[PDB]
């Protein structure tokens, strides 16, 4: 039988007023015989009508993927409204309902600290600039690195780790040529999270 999967907006999209957050109700295993799918959407149990169906996609395994997309408002999401996708179809004894929302819980502000490389790292060809982000709730976030207005893409970031006080930490490590560090170049940690002022903070880092 046909199966339903419901997916949240990207954090960045819920957090940048200039972006468009959307929730997405994907239905897989849609038979060639009974391809017709009906979406009803509810927001905190109240029905809404502005969803839109994406173009039908035929798969390798002889079945259709049908996808409906609900635009949502930045603040409904961040205020925690619950979004319900209800899917009907002939091959289905009963409509499948699925619900999602932001994780429940009082938001807490990340503490964002930048950290120079270890003295002992200074022999090597490349050094690690560390961005520690500690004590945020919920785990929804974006961390990025830059220098002089341009993105620096040679970083990696840990997933959120749950802590004993109930908030999360992670760290992001950007890797530069030692000579770039030695050259006075200023680097910056971009953190986007709901409980920050204007959803954004930035911390800088240079040779002292």
């Amino acid at each position: 039988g046909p199966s339903v999967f419901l997916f949240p907006p990207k954090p960045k999209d819920t957090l940048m007023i200039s972006r468009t957050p959307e929730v997405t109700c994907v239905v897989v295993d849609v038979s060639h015989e009974d391809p017709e799918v009906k979406f009803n959407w509810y927001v905190d149990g109240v029905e809404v009508h502005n969803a839109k169906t994406k173009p039908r996609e035929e798969q390798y395994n002889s079945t259709y993927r049908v996808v409906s997309v609900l635009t949502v408002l930045h603040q409904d999401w961040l205020n925690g409204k619950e979004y319900k996708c209800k899917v009907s179809n002939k091959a289905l004894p009963a409509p499948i309902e699925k619900t999602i929302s932001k994780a429940k819980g009082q938001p807490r502000e990340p503490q964002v600290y930048t950290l120079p490389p270890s003295r002992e790292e200074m022999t090597k060809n490349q050094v690690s600039l560390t961005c520690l982000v500690k004590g945020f709730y919920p785990s929804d976030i974006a961390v990025e690195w830059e220098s002089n207005g341009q993105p620096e893409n040679n970083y990696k970031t840990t997933p959120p780790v749950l802590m004993s006080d109930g908030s999360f930490f992670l760290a992001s490590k950007l890797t530069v040529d030692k000579s770039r560090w030695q050259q006075g170049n200023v680097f910056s940690c971009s953190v986007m999270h709901e409980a920050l002022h204007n959803h954004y903070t930035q911390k800088s880092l240079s040779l002292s």
Binding site: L15, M16, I17, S18, E144, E146, G149, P151, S190, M192, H197, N198, H199, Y200
Partner: peptide, 13 residues
């Protein structure tokens, strides 16, 4: 005030 990310507006209070 307002915050911007790579010249793209984030949010304003």
């Amino acid at each position: 005030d307002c915050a911007w990310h790579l010249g793209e507006l984030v949010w304003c209070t």
